[PDB]
Amino acid sequence: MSAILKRAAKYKRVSSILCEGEAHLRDPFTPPPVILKPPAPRKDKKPDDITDFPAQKLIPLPESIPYQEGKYRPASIPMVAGFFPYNCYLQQGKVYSWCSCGISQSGPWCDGLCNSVVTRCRPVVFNVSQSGYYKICNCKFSANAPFCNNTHRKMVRYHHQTHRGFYEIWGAALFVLGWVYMGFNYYT
Amino acid sequence: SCTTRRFIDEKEKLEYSRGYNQQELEASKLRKDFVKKYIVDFDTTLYKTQVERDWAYIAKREYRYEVQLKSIGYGGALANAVLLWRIYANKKMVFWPIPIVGALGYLYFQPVFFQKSNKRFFDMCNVGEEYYLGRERNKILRECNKILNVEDF
Amino acid sequence: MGSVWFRNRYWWYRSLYDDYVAREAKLAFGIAAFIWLPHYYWGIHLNRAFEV
Amino acid sequence: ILKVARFRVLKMRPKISTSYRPHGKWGDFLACIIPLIWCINILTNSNLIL
């Protein structure tokens, strides 16, 4: 370990934050990070002893969350219900429970399958002061949830950018081109 | 007719290997010029009669398969060989040889296949003297017969 | 080309089978796009033979 | 076949099947298009010959 100790003087550490960023700056329910100092080691370790580490605050899962004014980040990764939104007519003053997890069987609105699937994404309970048609998000990644903000187009672009998604999309494309070419060459 | 097609192809290959003399080359040039003018470089659908249109299109498709597609295949093989050579030389993928070398190979191989199969294309246009195409074909056939001091159908 | 047309893809899967073979189904398109060319060309040749 | 033979064995990547009961409602209808096309082709050819 002599070499490691010698080089440790000039070795430098780098931050452990990556593309995912910090969740407390985008999720109201995520508390700011806090460092906990372990107590001194136990001189005697009894077979039936319990941890002396300082307790961490416990935040239970809320039944529903309010409307984030364009600053919504899902707690977990939701299922992509659809790649384009739903043009739904909302009534004035009626409370709607938009589905966040993305597996709801009742459409954009929560059906209860969030309680049956393992996810921290909770339904968004919101109200509208003016009745009319709104585009409700289906990919469940919109920052303006429950309202669509054209994030599904970027999700589609990322799917096409991925190596396997590109392959799937263009394999289907060439499969249809097979029909097109058969029609074009039908007469020979 | 598969037997006839095989026999004709083998006869053409044997003749090409044998070579041609002055008279044969002149007759082949006349036939190739006629075929290119009346079939390859002309829209067959513009002829008058349905029979002549259909037979001219059959001749055009036979010419396509026996000359254009074969030349494309051979030129593509040559371009692929050159592409492999350049890929080995540069230790990477190159795209320039494909178009240029393919075009050069097609230009090199089209004349030889056209010379090989000139007689078949000329003979497939013998629709009959009752039509313009057949009359021109008969005129060219008479000229070739006069040149070669022989008679052909 | 299937579930994409549906805005509830989970419902699509559940109501069809409650099973997930979408990965294989969408990967198979690439292979199916070319696995048929020799058969199609030989069939064209056979059809021409029948016409003759 | 390839996926099942390569990953679904206990050794490689078993999956915890938590689903209790099926919920398909129209998968049979969707699948029966192919046998439907088979029957249509059979009927067409048979009737044309008849």
């Binding site: 020979t188 | 498709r61 | 069939g43 021409r48 016409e51 | 249509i40």
Partner: peptide, 20 residues
């Protein structure tokens, strides 16, 4: 069916009589 044969050789014309 609609395009079960997947191709038709319409190019193949009726053989032309070549009798004298």
């Amino acid at each position: 069916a609609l395009f079960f044969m997947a191709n038709t050789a319409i190019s193949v014309p009726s053989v032309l009589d070549t009798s004298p």
